[PDB]
């Protein structure tokens, strides 16, 4: 039951990583002046790509 | 005719006669056409080329 | 002679072996042409 508990919190700190790499998705395109990055979008494509 | 399930016929006082059939004497062995299909005959006639 | 008995998937020398032949798919590259299509379409075809 522990290894069932610390794999799901391996997969719990795999939804930590995810979440930290999508918060650093957007704090480099927040919504800059700018509004359009194709070369950072159309290479990334973490999540909700489309605002240019 | 006789089916898969085998044949019986008696005639007169005598022992009944049992009949079974079999993979017959011509078909299409291992062959370089296509040569199958008539000994797909064989096994399974009017089925299994339905399949086909 | 009832041992002898058959099921359906049985094998000859040869018939799977043109099994393998006639399994020469073509649809897996026109698929690849589908993704080179919306991956062109991805200039602007990039949320759905």
Redesign the interface.
């Known amino acids: 039951s522990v290894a069932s508990f610390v794999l799901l919190s391996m997969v719990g700190t795999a939804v930590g990583m995810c979440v930290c790499a999508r918060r650093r998705c957007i704090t480099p395109y927040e919504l800059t002046p700018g509004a359009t990055v194709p070369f950072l979008l159309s290479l990334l494509c973490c999540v909700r790509t489309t605002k240019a | 005719t006789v089916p898969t399930e085998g044949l019986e016929v008696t005639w007169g006082n005598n022992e009944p006669y049992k009949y079974?059939p079999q993979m017959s004497t011509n078909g299409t062995a291992?062959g370089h056409p296509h040569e199958?299909i008539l000994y797909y005959y064989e096994?399974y006639p009017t089925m299994?080329v339905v399949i086909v | 002679a009832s041992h002898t008995t058959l099921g359906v998937q049985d094998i000859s020398t040869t018939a799977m072996s043109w099994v393998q032949k006639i399994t020469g798919g073509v649809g897996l590259i026109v698929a690849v042409a589908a993704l080179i299509l919306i991956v062109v379409l991805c200039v602007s075809f990039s949320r759905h």
């Open positions: 079974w291992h199958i096994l299994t």
